[PDB]
Write a protein that binds this ligand. Structure first.
Ligand SMILES: NC(=O)c1ccc[n+]([C@@H]2O[C@H](COP(=O)([O-])OP(=O)(O)OC[C@H]3O[C@@H](n4cnc5c(N)ncnc54)[C@H](O)[C@@H]3O)[C@@H](O)[C@H]2O)c1
Ligand SMILES: NC(=O)c1ccc[n+]([C@@H]2O[C@H](COP(=O)([O-])OP(=O)(O)OC[C@H]3O[C@@H](n4cnc5c(N)ncnc54)[C@H](O)[C@@H]3O)[C@@H](O)[C@H]2O)c1
Ligand SMILES: NC(=O)c1ccc[n+]([C@@H]2O[C@H](COP(=O)([O-])OP(=O)(O)OC[C@H]3O[C@@H](n4cnc5c(N)ncnc54)[C@H](O)[C@@H]3O)[C@@H](O)[C@H]2O)c1
Ligand SMILES: NC(=O)c1ccc[n+]([C@@H]2O[C@H](COP(=O)([O-])OP(=O)(O)OC[C@H]3O[C@@H](n4cnc5c(N)ncnc54)[C@H](O)[C@@H]3O)[C@@H](O)[C@H]2O)c1
Lengths: 259, 259, 259, 259
């Protein structure tokens, strides 16, 4: 077969203590992978990795701290010997207008900087160090050494009012996908991005039932939030068929976020 | 699990006697689907369906002939009892300039009409009649009755010189994806499109080794043509992962067809 | 200056008896161009060209009839000596579902074929014959001989329920833009496409006040339908700055057509 | 007419001492605008504003410094009384691989942060403070108070090897366009983005003649670099044609940057 198994592959998943990252971790472990969850010391990463078993470790690190990402990845190398997959999933989401015209108040622009730091700089930091570990691998049967899977958002395409900073960070992840795939083409490292629609994760837990019902009403079909396993399954499919590369895949039940 | 098995699903694959359609047919059959290949009486469809075994039938028909498509789908219903999946894959590809400026000669405009008839009208015809069969299903646990998977091409986005007619037909398939997913949203019929890059099929059989090497040189990574099983694997993932809807997925090794 | 004047350029505008085509004709005549309006004998083309003055002629033709397009363009050559601009604007719009699931009724697929014939085949027919006339021109200061401006629609990107055939035809026009620009690159013929949002034209005159108010409510800003002059002005800008090529330009007041 | 004149409009152009920003500044000045160029104290902004005459001022500031941007825009208000237009044009471009696989060396990740700071944070800072000034205008006859024009790049879509950071910053600008247009929709502030191809500016001054010839060879038609006046002409068209909103316009001679 031209498709490979996930069995015995080593994957790092940032933001893996929660939501979509945890969904990807569970799906990969379920199909025989070793998984390191990278998440904040304040996260529940230790408890999550414990419940997920002996093929799952928790490497605490902030993706905005390059030295912490370096050491987390060096612990992955010590524990599992190699890295095959890096899943960029950690991210934060703000909602604010740049200038409230009615009340004449400027936003806090540092909220733009923090969004860009976690959601973009963290992806570059994790991608750079993952590539360093991949370069230790021998090219496999397909000439491959690793794959980087980034988590953007349909906000990169359908950004709503209040989301300019978030949509900018997600559009940055869209824009980096193809040049990075081109950078690593002859090194055998693919780069693919998933753009989820609305998924039922802690990121959406602040919303009350009225807002949840309104957001579900917008999703054409299936008429529900996505579930983390469906994101994890798409992550797994990218891992298994090597001809996916340099592309952004919308996973959203045909949602287009309205004005 | 939120992802379903392919086992027992009944799939119609147009163009199924060759190339990508045959790739999708074989992949679904190997994962337990019942597959009907719809292809031209002049094709090798009978022998191919024999090769693929007892879970495969050949329904001869031209996708440009509404009465033949309706007849073929009635045969699918008679044989397998229902329809779950329709893969629009049949298509043709010409190469010509609309006006040769150096020689002062107009193209054969009916070559554009034929491209549009097979590549677009055929998809609309198959989709409408597949929808008729889906409407006889009960909604499953995800609220679904069927899924239509269209094969566009990255020529819809990267159209090369000589490809205006082919690119137009493939751009049409891209454009139809979201409104059709919206049409059938509350009916539980998803519509998803795959945009393949260059794949090793009889469509490319004419090209001599020098052209093959040149085209391979363009693909960043994996540095090869796609193989039909990778297209069929993506078809199956769309079948199993219900939150994919209304999207176009490039499957192309990061290729961007140049000028 | 690197930008040229419209003064003394010869432009053909299909669908020019009405709506956006007439808007482009008026804007070009207002800025010193000779304009031939191509439209159906049933249209008001003769009356419109009369009111638009002696720099405007009416060449009756159906864009689905290649021989009628050939003769219209040969009359443009007799009347004005040359062709500099061809604006593809004629189009038709249907609204229908491919299969009404509630009442179990298939659409009339010939409505798909007619949509594709007028909206796509007509653009190819007009583009081919315009190119033939352009090839008679000497390359200008910028190396250019002509420009083809196609009118797609944001339905090529935001297609709503009921619009699958229309969105397919408009996605076909999107897809043809880049390969045609590449075809004619070294012949000096640019190809650019405009994707209008909702404009106040006879195409939208069937809608009652309640529907009009609903459609206006969807347009973020300016909160109104576009006016034909704004489409005509963008057509003119494409004519005047030669570095626009191979692109589709949304002209829509930030509208995204919702589910 | 639905298209307004540029005469009397007050425009701030960041990066206005060079290249495309200077191109936009000169075009608006020649059509009667008051223009303030915002650029670094180390730039030639003072001399350039002298060249451009009495309707041009130089407001020194770094777009990464919110207090300097606010101060510069207060100067614009003091001198010209209001603000109608803000052109985000200032930006930097690095070229580097995230990990050199052959030499086993990580990139300087702070080069990514600087790219994002100037190219994205600077656009957000200028946009927020420009919005503050727009909010002091009365709505004009089209209901508008201002327009923000961002300069992305086709690297947002065609990112080459070595360009991941630059492409990310330009993809961020693409992503921010629609949500910002939605943010300010009822306030009458449009947001439009231009994605230039390769233009003849000091950003490309380092490249020797062999690289220039190679890059020119890639542009289909016109087969040359863009000149800054063509960028300024498109800026002016967006200023005058109010139905352009929430869109990204490629201005690139049909170039698609290859692998
Ligand atoms: N959930 C959705 O509906 C949705 C939609 C589109 C895209 N996304 C994207 O999906 C990704 C995952 O979202 P989610 O729903 O799982 O969110 P979540 O809040 O459930 O999980 C985010 C995780 O990131 C971690 N994290 C935050 N900052 C970090 C840092 N500096 N270093 C390391 N880890 C850090 C958090 O601790 C948390 O565990 C994000 O990038 C988000 O933007 C989410
Ligand atoms: N092969 C590639 O590199 C590639 C990449 C881009 C897109 N595609 C698309 O993939 C699809 C499959 O192409 P392929 O590579 O498998 O080509 P292929 O020639 O191997 O197979 C196409 C099949 O379509 C059938 N067909 C043609 N006209 C038909 C009609 N009127 N009715 C019914 N069947 C008809 C043919 O009999 C043939 O078996 C097409 O839609 C094509 O445009 C192919
Ligand atoms: N108006 C909108 O809101 C809108 C939005 C998106 C795109 N468009 C596109 O803009 C273009 C113009 O639309 P409009 O609003 O001006 O419509 P319209 O109905 O006002 O004008 C269409 C014109 O096309 C002509 N035409 C039709 N069939 C023809 C044929 N076979 N040969 C020659 N002429 C023919 C008609 O006679 C008519 O004058 C169309 O292509 C349409 O799809 C319209
Ligand atoms: N030139 C091209 O080929 C091309 C194509 C794609 C995109 N672009 C984009 O066009 C824009 C303009 O680039 P250009 O070609 O005119 O380059 P340029 O180098 O000629 O001009 C850029 C100007 O930005 C100013 N600038 C830099 N950092 C600044 C800061 N912190 N604060 C204020 N001003 C600052 C510089 O002083 C300089 O004058 C950029 O955003 C660039 O990414 C350029």
């Amino acid at each position: 077969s031209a498709l490979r198994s996930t069995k015995g592959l080593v994957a790092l998943v940032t933001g893996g203590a929660s939501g979509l990252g945890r969904g990807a971790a569970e799906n990969l472990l379920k199909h025989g992978a070793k998984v390191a969850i990278l998440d904040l010391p304040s996260s529940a990463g230790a408890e999550v990795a414990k419940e997920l078993g002996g093929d799952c470790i928790f490497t605490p690190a902030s993706v905005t701290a390059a030295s912490e990402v370096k050491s987390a990845l060096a612990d992955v190398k010590k524990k599992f010997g190699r890295l095959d997959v890096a899943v960029n999933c950690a991210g934060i989401a703000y909602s604010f207008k740049l200038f409230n015209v009615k009340k004449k108040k400027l936003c806090d622009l540092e909220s733009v900087r923090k969004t860009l730091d976690v959601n973009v700089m963290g992806y570059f930091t994790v991608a750079a160090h993952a590539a360093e570990l991949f370069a230790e691998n021998e090219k496999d049967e397909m000439g491959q050494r690793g794959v980087i899977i980034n988590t953007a958002s349909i906000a990169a395409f359908d950004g709503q009012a209040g989301q300019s900073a978030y949509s900018a960070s997600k559009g940055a992840i869209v824009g980096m996908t193809l040049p990075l795939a081109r950078d690593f083409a002859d090194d055998g490292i693919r780069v693919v991005t998933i753009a989820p629609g609305i998924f039922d994760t802690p990121m959406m837990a602040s919303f009350p039932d009225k807002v949840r019902n309104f957001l579900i009403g917008l999703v054409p079909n299936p008429k529900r939030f996505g579930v983390p396993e469906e994101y994890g399954a798409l992550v797994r499919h990218i891992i298994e068929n090597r001809y996916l590369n340099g592309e952004v895949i919308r996973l959203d039940g045909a949602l287009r976020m309205p004005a």
